[PDB]
Amino acid sequence: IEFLNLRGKRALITAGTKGAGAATVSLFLELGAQVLTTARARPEGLPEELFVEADLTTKEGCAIVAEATRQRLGGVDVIVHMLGGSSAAGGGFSALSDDDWYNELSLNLFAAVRLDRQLVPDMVARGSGVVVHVTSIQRVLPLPESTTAYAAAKAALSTYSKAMSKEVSPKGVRVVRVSPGWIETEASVRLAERLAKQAGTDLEGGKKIIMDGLGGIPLGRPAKPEEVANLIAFLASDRAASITGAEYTIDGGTVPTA
Amino acid sequence: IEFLNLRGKRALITAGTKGAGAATVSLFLELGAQVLTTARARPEGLPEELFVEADLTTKEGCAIVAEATRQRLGGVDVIVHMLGGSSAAGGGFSALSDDDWYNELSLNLFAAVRLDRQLVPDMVARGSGVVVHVTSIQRVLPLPESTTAYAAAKAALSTYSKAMSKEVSPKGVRVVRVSPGWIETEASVRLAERLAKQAGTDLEGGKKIIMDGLGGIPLGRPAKPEEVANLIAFLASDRAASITGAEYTIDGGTVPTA
Amino acid sequence: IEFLNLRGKRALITAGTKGAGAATVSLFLELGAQVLTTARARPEGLPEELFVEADLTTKEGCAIVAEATRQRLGGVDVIVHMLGGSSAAGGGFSALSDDDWYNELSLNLFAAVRLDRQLVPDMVARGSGVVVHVTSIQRVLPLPESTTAYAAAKAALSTYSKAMSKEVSPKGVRVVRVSPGWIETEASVRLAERLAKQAGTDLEGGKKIIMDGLGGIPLGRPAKPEEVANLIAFLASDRAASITGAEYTIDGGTVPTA
Amino acid sequence: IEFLNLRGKRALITAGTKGAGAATVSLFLELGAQVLTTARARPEGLPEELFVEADLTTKEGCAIVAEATRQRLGGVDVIVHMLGGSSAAGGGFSALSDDDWYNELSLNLFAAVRLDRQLVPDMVARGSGVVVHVTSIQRVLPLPESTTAYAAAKAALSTYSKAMSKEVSPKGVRVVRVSPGWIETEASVRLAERLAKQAGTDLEGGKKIIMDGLGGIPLGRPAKPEEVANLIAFLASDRAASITGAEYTIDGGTVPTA
Ligand SMILES: [Cl-]
Ligand SMILES: [Cl-]
Ligand SMILES: [Cl-]
Ligand SMILES: [Cl-]
Ligand SMILES: [Cl-]
Ligand SMILES: [Cl-]
Ligand SMILES: [Cl-]
Ligand SMILES: [Cl-]
Ligand SMILES: [Cl-]
Ligand SMILES: [Cl-]
Ligand SMILES: [Cl-]
Ligand SMILES: [Cl-]
Ligand SMILES: [Mg+2]
Ligand SMILES: [Mg+2]
Ligand SMILES: [Mg+2]
Ligand SMILES: [Mg+2]
User: Which residues bind Ca(2+) 4 (chains A, B, C, D) (predicted)?
Assistant: First the structure.
């Protein structure tokens, strides 16, 4: 039995170069979806048809991607908003400049907002489709050292997503959130290695430092990119037709409240 | 590609006679699981090996089922606690007798507690497994007319489940909650028909009365039993290995908060 | 200016022998309220008129207190449900017996339920009054070692309280929850001292052990009994006439989610 | 007994011209605080020393107010961030322009962020003080017609506030949120009257239309400006010394979840 498939579905998945983005692109293709993804620069190995080059942190980039989506897919059945991250330095709330706030909002909130504004009305007119906003456990569990503005932007995204669900769910478009905790990437593995040029070393000890900083991960490990992809594919499928306006956390139990 | 399967997995699914319980039993069997389910009386059509007869609202019934599980399955990889419901009359909090409170707790909370106490330690010793507590959106969104004690019992279940996840997730047993809104069953369809011997009639109008009572369902319809089964099977599978200590709501958007 | 007073108000405050219970009794008397409080045995120093002797963990005790309230106060304007606690040993969920579950529910949930059932309808008939359910941060942030059933019972209480608020708030009775974190009592100070007959000693070090177990208290200290009383008196006063159906946390920031 | 006072305390209360802002200014002055408040233009009746003229929706305005605070108060013990509102038209998420998003963020989020960045470090250096972020129930309960961006901005504010509390609470500065539902103002009373030039008329009927739009208010009426002021004064006082990192909702029970 083929429990789940995405055959025929046209999907825009933002930021599919690496990490969970790449894993989600890869899984969607496995499941039969036609995929368009985005990056500032196309990675050398993958088909030109799969990528549109753009800076989604700018309104010009969003305009380009929305149009490319229309031209390449002809329409969208699934949007997965994966673009996100934080580049702010540490030092707490008072070390955040106007630039930092603008950067955090542009990356984590505005790309989804701008793309949705362009693409969702057509989905509503058709009367079917799914939008997945990838938020972050920091939206409920903020970590202040360098991610105060990151957390705030993800909280804006989460509530924006719920608001949109209230509007478009009655019209047949589902809108869900996926909220990951720590995801194991090349970047994070190197971060774990880094925290070992400082006191300690062992890598495992480095990962422990990171996990303790989150308040501990009951599962004892971060999520793999493929595991985030798994949840997103499930939510985008017809096996999830009654799921909308909800946030599905994938964090190994990190968020410690019920 | 076979995205999801449950081959080899041994599953206890409580209360599998009808509704979402029956749909979950049916889906698990489709996906290759060995299933044991429970009811006060076996339905006439289905194999004797599939059912254990017991009253899970009593501690004797729970003792019987735990032992039957050991004898028939030899061990458990997945427990899905589906037993739940409310038999209290209306009249608000002051119309709830001591019997009503006892009944609501015994049905919605104590069966899971008693079974988990017996079965989960062996899963922990093996170092693998999944427990699914089926709660209810009323645990966060209580409706006072007849379901004040029902809501309270489901809230106890939800927090109990989270507590257990904190303890056993580090030992390799995942513990998740599935929180349904209104599920379309034979009982509810007849309820919709009933609210038409009162003012109105149209059935569709009857379902509207029910949905308005919930504060509205953005999706515009209740969940189907098969849709609840879909989510439970996903959570029980290895595609969900990083998901624990979380509650996954399936309610068409009913809960109106982010 | 006398910002706040409780002159003329008749208050039942359960479990007022010590800790926050005693501090709340004391503050209410300071603010002009007529108070009735409860204990298994009256403390030697305080007026007989102030206390009714009863075991509120039994339905007989609740019946006695409700009647004593009617006889001594003639009516109730404010009920503060402070009775709560946990006597379960450690060992996690599987070490909880049927007795443990019964004890936790009887102490933390059933006394409020039984008393409310008797007393609240008269408040509703008058069309004014306040009920304060003292819950616990464990209702959202459960700690599994010895307090799995305690957390579950407090979650039941919290959702029960919200359900009741939906019913009686439109009739002019406010129903609010106060959710304390760690409260500094004689018992807890001795617990801090105890964890020093084990590794360490310093008392301050003992309090650190406790706080770390909670995941840390940002404020850096537990709440004082008087501080819990402060919040309860505010909520019971006419300065809080628009506050109902809400839970007010007093925990020095312990709960780490927004 | 003088339960509560704010004598000696120096308070910046933003946006104190009308509504809850004016009521909070008035109450703080009653309780002995030295107050500085803000508006685009000073209302004709009140002392020049009480107001600084500025447009807090701009970074220049925030710079002006922070400096005026330093000159007029010499230091700040309490900041109450009351500035907020929405000017977006209806039409749902797709009717929100880039200007709308910028306006909603600048008004509801950025004024607090910019002021806090300037003023909070000095409070931290002193080791005492309170910051109150006035959010909105829409941060959890978003209403999509015209307030999608408003809700998102208030959610950003709420999580930002929690993040800051984690950082500065250990240093002796408390950071709390007050989350109002509908507040009765001149503007809203006229809105109620307006919805009567449309179908209906009765004013009471107009207020019913508004309340139904919120999903109903169990209390049956909006909060008064003075009632919001009451809660803010309590939270700013030494009677609330153990309350930090929490959000206190004042909405007559509107938010329907526990
Ligand atoms: Cl990677
Ligand atoms: Cl496939
Ligand atoms: Cl929704
Ligand atoms: Cl059925
Ligand atoms: Cl299969
Ligand atoms: Cl967990
Ligand atoms: Cl004490
Ligand atoms: Cl007084
Ligand atoms: Cl309520
Ligand atoms: Cl006004
Ligand atoms: Cl005063
Ligand atoms: Cl905090
Ligand atoms: Mg910076
Ligand atoms: Mg009854
Ligand atoms: Mg025990
Ligand atoms: Mg607009």
Answer: 215
Q: What are the φ/ψ torsions at residue A39 (nearest 5 degrees)? A: -170, 160
For B43, the token pair is: 């339905």
Tell me the backbone φ, ψ of residue D123, rounded to 5 degrees: -65, -45
Residues in binding site of A for Mg(2+): 95, 100
Sheet holding A51-53, edge to edge: A51-53, A34-39, A10-13, A78-81, A129-134, A173-180, A247-250
Paired strand residues for C131:
C79, C175
Q: For A64-87, b where at least 16 C-beta lie within 10 A, e where not — what string? A: bbbebbeebbeebbbbbbbbbebe
Q: How far apart are CA B168 and CA A142, in angstroms?
A: 25
In sign, the C-alpha dihedral spanning C162, C168, C170, C173 is negative
- List the chains bordering chain C where 3 or more Cβ pairs fall under 8 Å: A, B, D
CA dihedral D234, A258, C154, D141 (to 10 degrees): 50
The correct CATH number of D1-258 out of 1.20.1250.20, 3.40.50.720, 3.30.1130.10, 3.40.50.80 is 3.40.50.720
Resolution of the entry in angstroms? 2.0
Length of chain B: 258
Question: Which residue in the set D139, D215, D258 is minimally distant from B256, CB to CB?
Answer: D215
Q: CB–CB of C258 and A140 under 8 A?
A: yes
Residue B32, annotated as binding a ligand: no
What are the residue boundaries of the structural domains of chain C, listed by start? 1-258
Contact (Cβ atoms closer than 8 angstroms) between residue D25 and residue D35:
yes
* Dihedral-angle region of residue B200 (phi above 0 means left; psi in -120 to 50 means alpha; beta otherwise): left
Instruction: Give one DSSP letter per residue of B79-132, joined into a string.
Output: EEE--------SS-GGG--HHHHHHHHIIIIIHHHHHHHHHHHHHHHHT-EEEE
Q: How many residues does chain A have?
A: 258
Amino acid at the residue A119: L
| Under 8 Å between Cβ of B134 and B115 | no
By C-alpha distance, which of D137, D160, B144, D247 is closest to C247? D247
Q: What's A107's DSSP letter?
A: I
Tokens of A124: 């509503």
DSSP characters over B230-250: HHHHHHHSGGGTT--S-EEEE
Q: If you write DSSP's letter for every residue of A195-244 in order, what string do you get?
A: TTTSS---SHHHHHHHHHHTT--TTSSPBPHHHHHHHHHHHHSGGGTT--
Residues of D in contact with A59 (CB under 8 A): 98
Give the method of determination: X-ray
Cβ contacts of A230 within 8 Å, gap of 6 or more: A27, B239, B240
